[PDB]
Amino acid sequence: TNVYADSFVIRGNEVSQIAPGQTGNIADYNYKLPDDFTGCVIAWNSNKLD
Amino acid sequence: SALTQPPSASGSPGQSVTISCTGASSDVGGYNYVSWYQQHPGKAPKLMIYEVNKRPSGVPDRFSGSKSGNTASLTISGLQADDEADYYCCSYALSRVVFGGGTMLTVLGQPKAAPSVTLFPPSSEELQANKATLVCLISDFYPGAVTVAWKADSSPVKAGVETTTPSKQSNNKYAASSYLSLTPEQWKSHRSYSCQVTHEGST
Amino acid sequence: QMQLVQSGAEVKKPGESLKISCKGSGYTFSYYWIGWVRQMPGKGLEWMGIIYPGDSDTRYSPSFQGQVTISADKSISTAYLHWSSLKASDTAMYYCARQGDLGDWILLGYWGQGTLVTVSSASTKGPSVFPLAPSSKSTSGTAALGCLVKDYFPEPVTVSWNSGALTSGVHTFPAVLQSSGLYSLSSVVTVPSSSLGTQTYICNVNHKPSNTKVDKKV
């Protein structure tokens, strides 16, 4: 019925915080997801572009 | 989509001018992914503006970028002699760069005068063989457009003629040269050939 | 100070392969995107692709996906641009650009010196010189003399006067493309009518591609 394709950049290892239930400064103050979240988390290396 | 720019631009020295650029793209990052480049005749281009709300470091303040809707613009604080060069805008939103049609910029204020006709008949050495060619030159004219015509004994000639309009100097003055090939028998078939300028009428 | 050096002009026949180079200096050739830009005579700039010295992650242009190849060597920090079966429309000035210390990674803040490419069906042939004597029937006013060069494909063909003398009153106009594929130019000199035949009034034409020397008086 609708889709929201969010995007952002992290230092690589901080991906462990971008997930429901996880904790950390990121998940607590920048990007928090609800327990009923439904979607996919996709990431790839961008050292040459970013 | 590809970018577009006006065919050419004009303006008087000292006055401000603006060059438009249509076709700017965007992405989820922002909408200021636009840049400009300048290229003088006979050398490589050079970045002038990028992120129109700003500009590259060390670039004089005479160049300023802007944008409104789906059309970018480049504003010059004041036209000068060194501003006679090509300008191109580019977009770098969707991880890709595509240059526009470009544009030619020139400044007014130079005085107009008369072109310089230079006529030479066939050489005495070439007429001795099956090869002969006339030579007519034009120069000392400010306009960047001119055409040459040929005729013999009031009969126009429109066969085997080539002409160019390159720059004599960098001081707002172009030049041109034309040639007309023919056989030694055709030379003696009519009166001496003549050259026409048609720059500002009968000339 | 950063700078890029490219190879000289290249001349070949239609349908022949070609490969040029562009060496950069003043920066670490490991973390700076390198690419090439096309610019035909009288046309605007046309981007073709970029590459990363760290890895051969080529990103060609949609109009140049298989018409040209781009690559670079990290052991010497020199890019390359190879062609296959050059067409008549491939003649153009190619500049190698790279990113700067600021801005986006595809901003191309710096450019190269450019490499010229030209092709033609006609083969190389030395230039032919002809003397342009002054009009003996209209000697009034200032006299005009010169020499006509014709039947030469190579561009580097140039002309001189008195082996380098006569700094003033002398000028050489660019060449023009002939219907047969060759070129032709003309050099003239203006002096008073009373000064005809002052010392020698001799022409001097040079041709490096073939090392052919042609000296003729007018």
mmCIF file with all atom_site columns, N, CA and C in Angstrom, chain C residues 2 25-32 53 77 98:
data_model
loop_
_atom_site.group_PDB
_atom_site.id
_atom_site.type_symbol
_atom_site.label_atom_id
_atom_site.label_alt_id
_atom_site.label_comp_id
_atom_site.label_asym_id
_atom_site.label_entity_id
_atom_site.label_seq_id
_atom_site.pdbx_PDB_ins_code
_atom_site.Cartn_x
_atom_site.Cartn_y
_atom_site.Cartn_z
_atom_site.occupancy
_atom_site.B_iso_or_equiv
_atom_site.pdbx_formal_charge
_atom_site.auth_seq_id
_atom_site.auth_comp_id
_atom_site.auth_asym_id
_atom_site.auth_atom_id
_atom_site.pdbx_PDB_model_num
ATOM 1  N N  . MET C 1 2  ? 49.652 19.959 -8.466  1.00 0.00 ? 2  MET C N  1
ATOM 2  C CA . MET C 1 2  ? 49.145 18.852 -9.262  1.00 0.00 ? 2  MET C CA 1
ATOM 3  C C  . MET C 1 2  ? 49.067 19.243 -10.734 1.00 0.00 ? 2  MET C C  1
ATOM 4  N N  . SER C 1 25 ? 50.513 13.841 -11.865 1.00 0.00 ? 25 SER C N  1
ATOM 5  C CA . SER C 1 25 ? 51.596 14.036 -10.913 1.00 0.00 ? 25 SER C CA 1
ATOM 6  C C  . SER C 1 25 ? 51.150 15.029 -9.851  1.00 0.00 ? 25 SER C C  1
ATOM 7  N N  . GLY C 1 26 ? 51.884 15.043 -8.740  1.00 0.00 ? 26 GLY C N  1
ATOM 8  C CA . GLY C 1 26 ? 51.588 15.927 -7.635  1.00 0.00 ? 26 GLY C CA 1
ATOM 9  C C  . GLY C 1 26 ? 50.561 15.405 -6.654  1.00 0.00 ? 26 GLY C C  1
ATOM 10 N N  . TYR C 1 27 ? 50.079 14.176 -6.831  1.00 0.00 ? 27 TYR C N  1
ATOM 11 C CA . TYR C 1 27 ? 49.087 13.607 -5.934  1.00 0.00 ? 27 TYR C CA 1
ATOM 12 C C  . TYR C 1 27 ? 49.226 12.092 -5.940  1.00 0.00 ? 27 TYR C C  1
ATOM 13 N N  . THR C 1 28 ? 48.685 11.466 -4.896  1.00 0.00 ? 28 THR C N  1
ATOM 14 C CA . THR C 1 28 ? 48.717 10.012 -4.768  1.00 0.00 ? 28 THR C CA 1
ATOM 15 C C  . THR C 1 28 ? 47.684 9.416  -5.716  1.00 0.00 ? 28 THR C C  1
ATOM 16 N N  . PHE C 1 29 ? 48.155 8.699  -6.737  1.00 0.00 ? 29 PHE C N  1
ATOM 17 C CA . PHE C 1 29 ? 47.280 8.107  -7.749  1.00 0.00 ? 29 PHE C CA 1
ATOM 18 C C  . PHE C 1 29 ? 46.673 6.801  -7.229  1.00 0.00 ? 29 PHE C C  1
ATOM 19 N N  . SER C 1 30 ? 45.963 6.915  -6.107  1.00 0.00 ? 30 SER C N  1
ATOM 20 C CA . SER C 1 30 ? 45.331 5.755  -5.490  1.00 0.00 ? 30 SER C CA 1
ATOM 21 C C  . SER C 1 30 ? 43.868 6.021  -5.160  1.00 0.00 ? 30 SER C C  1
ATOM 22 N N  . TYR C 1 31 ? 43.532 7.274  -4.853  1.00 0.00 ? 31 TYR C N  1
ATOM 23 C CA . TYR C 1 31 ? 42.210 7.624  -4.342  1.00 0.00 ? 31 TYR C CA 1
ATOM 24 C C  . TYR C 1 31 ? 41.672 8.865  -5.040  1.00 0.00 ? 31 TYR C C  1
ATOM 25 N N  . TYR C 1 32 ? 41.751 8.896  -6.369  1.00 0.00 ? 32 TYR C N  1
ATOM 26 C CA . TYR C 1 32 ? 41.233 10.007 -7.159  1.00 0.00 ? 32 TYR C CA 1
ATOM 27 C C  . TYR C 1 32 ? 40.640 9.462  -8.448  1.00 0.00 ? 32 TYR C C  1
ATOM 28 N N  . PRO C 1 53 ? 41.578 4.531  -9.262  1.00 0.00 ? 53 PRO C N  1
ATOM 29 C CA . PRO C 1 53 ? 42.890 3.860  -9.234  1.00 0.00 ? 53 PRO C CA 1
ATOM 30 C C  . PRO C 1 53 ? 42.948 2.681  -8.280  1.00 0.00 ? 53 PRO C C  1
ATOM 31 N N  . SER C 1 77 ? 50.988 5.363  -12.441 1.00 0.00 ? 77 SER C N  1
ATOM 32 C CA . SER C 1 77 ? 50.040 6.466  -12.304 1.00 0.00 ? 77 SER C CA 1
ATOM 33 C C  . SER C 1 77 ? 49.820 7.161  -13.650 1.00 0.00 ? 77 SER C C  1
ATOM 34 N N  . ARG C 1 98 ? 39.910 14.837 -13.316 1.00 0.00 ? 98 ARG C N  1
ATOM 35 C CA . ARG C 1 98 ? 39.969 14.138 -12.042 1.00 0.00 ? 98 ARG C CA 1
ATOM 36 C C  . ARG C 1 98 ? 39.308 14.999 -10.975 1.00 0.00 ? 98 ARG C C  1
#
